[PDB]
Amino acid sequence: STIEERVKKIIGQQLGVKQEEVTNNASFVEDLGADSLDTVELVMALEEEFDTEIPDEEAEKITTVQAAIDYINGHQA
């Protein structure tokens, strides 16, 4: 039940792939290809997911899977 264990879910889900698909060193921008309609729904959800207002700054390490899992893990700190 690692941090990403919860991020991968909503993540892969936001895209439409099992949590197993969502790798670590991947990319939800190219690897998968999440249009601006999939990426958004991703963050929007990710936020409420843990009731958090992802700040612009933090809006940097959230282009792939692990990335998000890292943000939800301990937040870019």
From Swiss-Prot:
Single biological process term from Gene Ontology: lipid biosynthetic process
Keywords assigned: Cytoplasm, Fatty acid biosynthesis, Fatty acid metabolism, Lipid biosynthesis, Lipid metabolism, Phosphopantetheine, Phosphoprotein
Function recorded in the entry: Carrier of the growing fatty acid chain in fatty acid biosynthesis.
Membrane-spanning intervals of the chain: none
Chain ranges of the Carrier domain: 1-76
The species this protein was found in: Escherichia coli (strain K12)
Subunit structure: Interacts with MukB.
Protein family (similarity comment): Belongs to the acyl carrier protein (ACP) family.
One Gene Ontology cellular component annotation held by this UniProt entry: cytoplasm
Modified residue annotations for O-(pantetheine 4'-phosphoryl)serine: S36
Pathway the protein contributes to: Lipid metabolism; fatty acid biosynthesis
NCBIfam families, sorted: acyl_carrier, PRK00982.1-2, PRK00982.1-3, PRK00982.1-4, PRK00982.1-5
Localization (cell): Cytoplasm
A Pfam family recorded for this sequence: PP-binding
Cited Gene3D superfamilies: ACP-like
Superkingdom of source: Bacteria
UniProt modification remark: 4'-phosphopantetheine is transferred from CoA to a specific serine of apo-ACP by AcpS. This modification is essential for activity because fatty acids are bound in thioester linkage to the sulfhydryl of the prosthetic group.
GO molecular function: acyl binding; acyl carrier activity; lipid binding; phosphopantetheine binding
Protein's name according to its UniProt entry: Acyl carrier protein
